[PDB]
Amino acid sequence: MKKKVWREEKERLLKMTLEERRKEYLRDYIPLNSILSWKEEMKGKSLTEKVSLYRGDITLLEVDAIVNAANASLLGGGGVDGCIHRAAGPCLLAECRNLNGCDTGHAKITCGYDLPAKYVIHTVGPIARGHINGSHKEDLANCYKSSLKLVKENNIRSVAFPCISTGIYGFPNEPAAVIALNTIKEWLAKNHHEVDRIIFCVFLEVDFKIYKKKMNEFFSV
Template structure:
């Protein structure tokens, strides 16, 4: 079975085998094998990955034509109405729980949203360079900033703090300490720990920004793979799978969206 990748060079089309694609490097010396793991690709030999070189640049893509976006509107959308990325006939397929959303998480409504922050749980109205925008934090109101001072004192040494959603459209906010550059295992653990917190508090849906995509200096493919592998490690247990109805992955960056779109089958199209 061939694992195919098609791309144009002038008028020529080149087809690479499943083995060749893992070693293929673009002109930027990016190895496709870094985006896929050997033990998982076997179940997805027919999946086609687009030229990774395109995904590593902040260019405008025609994402809006293929996926709905909330932009400069006042309407709040309940995440229960967002369609899953792909409905699988097997009820225990992880993709049945995953939503990939291109848009501002400020305009979504759900049980919980994740705020990536630093080790002192710093909140800044201008945007703290992490992964919930200052715009979202401001919608929560002054009460969040005031209560966070007490919450930090009561949760010293912890990596997760749970607060109310205040004036935002979310019932709760899960604040999680992000690791820094190259600490990919810790980044994966962030997703597992946040999802465990959601399970323990009976949150049925949870909205994630892409943790590590702010000032934490992770490479883009590490951000995406850590996200998907962290979710997989949690969801592969049946009781965890049953505890969560929807996981919404939210981004406003087209290159991240495209990486997620092309990698999600490899990591999460799995029956548990």
């Protein structure tokens, strides 16, 4: 498609309200107000009001931004990257094409198009074919930092992150969670007034259990 088709669709969407946007959805959505804060989850038995754990499909989330664990081309592929591209529709590929790829540990922002999410932040996680090393640890932190820099610059008040570089990209689940949680905690300490929620999207039981154990450690007392 021609660049003015995605550019015009993007301008159309970005000036709409939630209520105008909602009228156009072809799927049921998950509004931010339906996801408990970790604070609500805990008094169910502070930065705990600013973080959530979510087990579902990231593409359902009506938030200012979802984070795509993309590949270097930004052209899509398999897993959730593929699910984000199908739910967003072909304007997402067209805008991504115009970005000319993305480096490891970097991020770029596009419109969300047909997603309930206003934007997609695309970030390229390190690939560990052997044991994680210093460079992989630094790049994974950089994915979170460069994503959160786009969150701050674009007045994104709600953002959902996947478990970047886990699975095929070879980052082990526990150490990846430590980097993700340290990076968001450090950023929240300086920027908490600028966001309503950071959501950790944790589909797999293995990731759900790891994050559940660590939320208090990073966000409590």
